Every structure is written in C-alpha cells, then in structure tokens.
C-alpha cells in the first residue's frame, strides 16, 4: 500500500476534496469547466489559465472501501460543486474524431464509466507529484495505458484529453474545512 500523498505530505483521504494543481507554478491553475462545441452547458473539464486560481474542489474516490488510497487503485474524480446541468459530479471520458476527451454528463453513469482513472507517481521530485492515467476497457477488465494532457482549443480553453505526448503532472492540495 504505497498510498497517495497530498501536497503538504499527508495521506490523501478517500472521498476527500482536493484542488488538482499543476506541479510547475507557471503552467496555470486548478481544474474547472467550460462550455464547448454544441454542449448546452459547461460539460467540458479544463484547466484554469489563472496561475493564482486553485480551481474547483475535486472529490477523489477509490474503488475500495479504504480510508486512504492505494497506489494502483482505480479512482473516480468529481466536482464537489458540479454545474447545475450535469446529472452527477463525476468525470468521464468520451470518444471523438480528435480522440478521447474528459467531460461531465447530463445523465447518471455506470460505475465502470467513472472509475476509469489512476494516479502514477513521478520520479525525480521532492514534492509528491503524479501523472493522471486513463484506463480503457479491456473487453472485460481495464488497462491504464494512456495519460491525460492539455489541448488548447481555438478559443483558448485548456481542455483535458487523452494525450500521446506531454502528460499533465499534478499536486493534490487538500480543500477547505
């Protein structure tokens, strides 16, 4: 059990809320939403361009019933305060011509459609920093073999989508209480 650790050195609490901040200060702020393409409301998960913004508090929930979160545990990530038009706070990944993208949903989704993320510790770093993996179905199981990154749309939105090249690296900062 090599548990997830937060930006202040404490074990990440399962079901707890955290800001998802970039490792490098210059690279923008925390996670929030945008309304893109033909969506009727903000259903796109993006990174804030404000380096001072902590973004939205995000709930991290494991596939296990543990107080903390083991390493290779699958997780679901959800907004503590989701846009009024999403049916639930949880993120999901949607296929597209450009490739899979991270979005919210106007309907309740099955657990196997939200429990599709995993954090991967980064080497060479003093603070606890992780990459974010996407785990596609394996006709029966699931395989975490693609990473999540940023694709800036023609409007400047910093969209979270599956990436091939430069994955994002995050620190998890515990949310207010």
Task: Residue 108: give its domain's CATH number.
Answer: 2.80.10.50
Q: How far apart are CA 91 and CA 44, in angstroms?
A: 9
Q: How far apart are CA 153 and CA 35, in angstroms?
A: 12
Q: How many domains does the chain have?
A: 1
Q: Beta-carbon neighbour count of residue 142 at 10 Å?
A: 16
Q: How far apart are CA 120 and CA 40, in angstroms?
A: 34
Q: Strands 169-174 and 158-163, how do they pair? A: unpaired
Q: Is 92 exposed, middle or buried (0-12, 13-18, 19+ CB in 10 A)?
A: buried
CB-based contact 134:99 (threshold 8 Å): no
Name the resolution in angstroms: 2.0
Tokens (6 digits) for 96: 């597209």
Q: How far apart are CA 110 and CA 36, in angstroms?
A: 24
| Alpha carbon distances (Å) from 149 to 51, 99, 101, 168 | 17, 12, 10, 5
| φ, ψ for residue 27, nearest 5 deg | -90, 20
Strand (E) positions, 40-174?
44-47, 58-62, 75-79, 92-94, 101-103, 117-121, 130-138, 141-152, 158-163, 169-174
- Beta partners for residue 152, in sequence order: 158
CB-based contact 6:12 (threshold 8 Å): yes
Q: Tokens 């929930």 correspond to what residue?
A: 61
Q: Tokens 């993006």 correspond to what residue?
A: 46
Radius of gyration (Cα) for the chain, nearest Å? 15
CB-based contact 18:170 (threshold 8 Å): no
Domain extent for 175: 1-177
CB-based contact 93:162 (threshold 8 Å): yes
Q: How far apart are CA 10 and CA 25, in angstroms?
A: 21
| φ, ψ for residue 25, nearest 5 deg | -50, -50
Q: Strands 169-174 and 17-22, how do they pair? A: antiparallel
* Exp. method: X-ray
Identify the CA nearest to 44 among candidates 97, 1, 2, 106: 106
Q: How far apart are CA 144 and CA 81, in angstroms?
A: 27
């Amino acid at each position: 059990d090599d548990d997830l650790v937060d930006a202040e050195g404490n074990l990440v609490e399962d079901g707890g809320t955290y800001y998802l901040l970039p490792h490098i200060w210059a690279h923008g702020g925390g996670i929030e939403t945008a309304k893109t393409g033909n969506e009727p409301c903000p259903l796109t998960v993006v990174r804030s361009p404000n380096e001072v913004s902590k973004g939205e508090p995000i709930r991290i929930s494991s596939q296990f019933l543990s107080l903390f979160i083991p390493r290779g545990s699958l997780v679901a990530l959800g907004f503590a305060n989701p846009p009024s038009c999403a049916a639930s706070p949880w993120w999901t990944v949607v296929d597209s011509p450009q490739g899979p993208a991270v979005k919210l949903s106007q309907q309740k989704l099955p657990e196997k459609d939200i429990l599709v993320f995993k954090f991967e510790k980064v080497s060479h770093s003093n603070i606890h920093v992780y990459k974010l993996l996407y785990c596609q179905h394996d006709e029966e199981d699931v395989k975490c073999d693609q990473y999540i990154g940023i694709h800036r749309d023609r409007n400047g939105n910093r969209r979270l989508v599956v990436t091939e090249e430069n994955p994002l690296e995050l620190v998890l900062l515990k949310a207010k209480s």
